[model samples]
Target: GSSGSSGPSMPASPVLTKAGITWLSLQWSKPSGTPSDEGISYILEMEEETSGYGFKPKYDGEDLAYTVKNLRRSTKYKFKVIAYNSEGKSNPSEVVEFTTCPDSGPSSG
Candidate 1:
């Protein structure tokens, strides 16, 4: 009998930012788990709120941060992340939401 190993723990909530006219930066921390010989990797999923569509794969890398470019301006979006290792993928992390900057720029108080 084989007891499969558990996946890595969920990472912290992602941080979203509008860095340019059509770019978003997502930052997050590494999940809690022992680093395997193969190491761990991360994947980010995203969805456009207005469309009511399911989350779609956005990015995958070994780093803890990623940048999303060419996003629609003034639109709302949500994101989640997951960690993976040789064992398998971990449960998704908490979702984070943010709105893209308007073409005119951030509003002044």
Candidate 2:
């Protein structure tokens, strides 16, 4: 059985930004138990908690950050992140909660 945080290493808390569009970024850390492998794959997800609508936000495999655009500014969103290895995914880190910028038109701005 695989235990969570069996060793000293842990994934960093992902930093998310709503600038221009919604952007998320995090550094990749080496897995504690396994080192024979090169790197770990990750899945970042966003969900509108109030509406129960989940969306797989866009990400590029090459970078540590991801951005999501065209989101409703007035809504509340919850995010989850998971780390994956050849064996399987690790227990997800703590969920992050953020509210988008308040919705406004040109008139309000």
- Identify the leading candidate in terms of lDDT: 1
Clashes of each: 0, 0
- Model 1, CA-based lDDT: 0.75
TM-score each candidate: 0.76, 0.57
lDDT of 1 at 40: 65
lDDT of candidate 1 over 34-76, digit per residue (tens) = 5555556788888765467577777878878888887877777
Question: Which lDDT value does model 1 have at 18?
Answer: 41
Compared to the true structure, candidate 1 yields what TM-score? Answer: 0.76
lDDT of each: 0.75, 0.52
What is candidate 2's lDDT per residue for 1-109, written digit by digit as tens? 5555332234554556543323333344344565445656656656664355545544435344566555665665666555655555555556776655554667654
Error of 1 at 109 (Å): 32
Off by over 4 Å in 1: 1-3, 17-19, 33-35, 49-53, 104-109
